[PDB]
Amino acid sequence: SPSAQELKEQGNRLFVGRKYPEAAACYGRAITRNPLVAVYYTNRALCYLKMQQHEQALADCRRALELDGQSVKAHFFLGQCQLEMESYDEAIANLQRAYSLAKEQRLNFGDDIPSALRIAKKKRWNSI
Ligand SMILES: CNC(=O)C[C@H](NC(=O)[C@@H]1CCC[C@H]1NC(=O)c1n[nH]c2c1CCCC2)c1ccccc1OC
């Protein structure tokens, strides 16, 4: 029987290989062993996003946020998901929140969050 962390790493490896259903199933098996780890839900939300399953991706972001309200990644993926759903105002607020949390936690993602914010703001404007 593999451990929860072994399953998270197998899921990450599968994600790098673009095997999204397989990766989501590994994160699900990690959750079965330990359902109190926010990053398992955040990682699976990204799989759901790659599989275009937006309602499932939102639900995993919410499960991650309930365990870790300070999650930079859960707010970032929530915002990206909302952007694809055309919920622009909500997307921008979550991306801005990921930016502020990353700055407070002294995390370095280069121009990842400002770039995502610019895409969302341009998409919101183009629709207006
Ligand atoms: C944004 N893309 C991912 O989070 C994919 C994820 N990458 C990581 O965990 C990177 C390894 C070390 C550094 C880390 N970077 C980030 O966390 C990251 N970068 N820009 C941002 C963030 C977080 C949110 C704001 C923008 C990943 C990689 C391999 C396999 C699976 C897997 O995730 C399921």
List keywords for this structure.
mainly alpha; 128 residues; binds the ligand CNC(=O)C[C@H](NC(=O)[C@@H]1CCC[C@H]1NC(=O)c1n[nH]c2c1CCCC2)c1ccccc1OC; monomer; Serine Threonine Protein Phosphatase 5, Tetratricopeptide repeat
CATH class: Mainly Alpha
| Small molecules in complex | the ligand CNC(=O)C[C@H](NC(=O)[C@@H]1CCC[C@H]1NC(=O)c1n[nH]c2c1CCCC2)c1ccccc1OC
Structural class: mainly alpha
Reported for the largest beta sheet, the result is:
none
Order of helices and strands: HHHHHHH
CATH topology: Serine Threonine Protein Phosphatase 5, Tetratricopeptide repeat
Separate helix tally: 7
* CA-based gyration radius: 15 Å
What is the oligomer described by this structure? monomer
Share in helix: over 70%
Inertia-based shape: globular
Distance between the termini: 53 Å
Q: What percentage of the residues does DSSP assign to strands (E)? A: under 5%
Number of domains: 1
TPR repeats: 4-37, 38-71, 73-105
Subcellular location: Cytoplasm; Nucleus; Mitochondrion
Modified residues (Phosphoserine): 1, 3, 127
Protein name: E3 ubiquitin-protein ligase CHIP
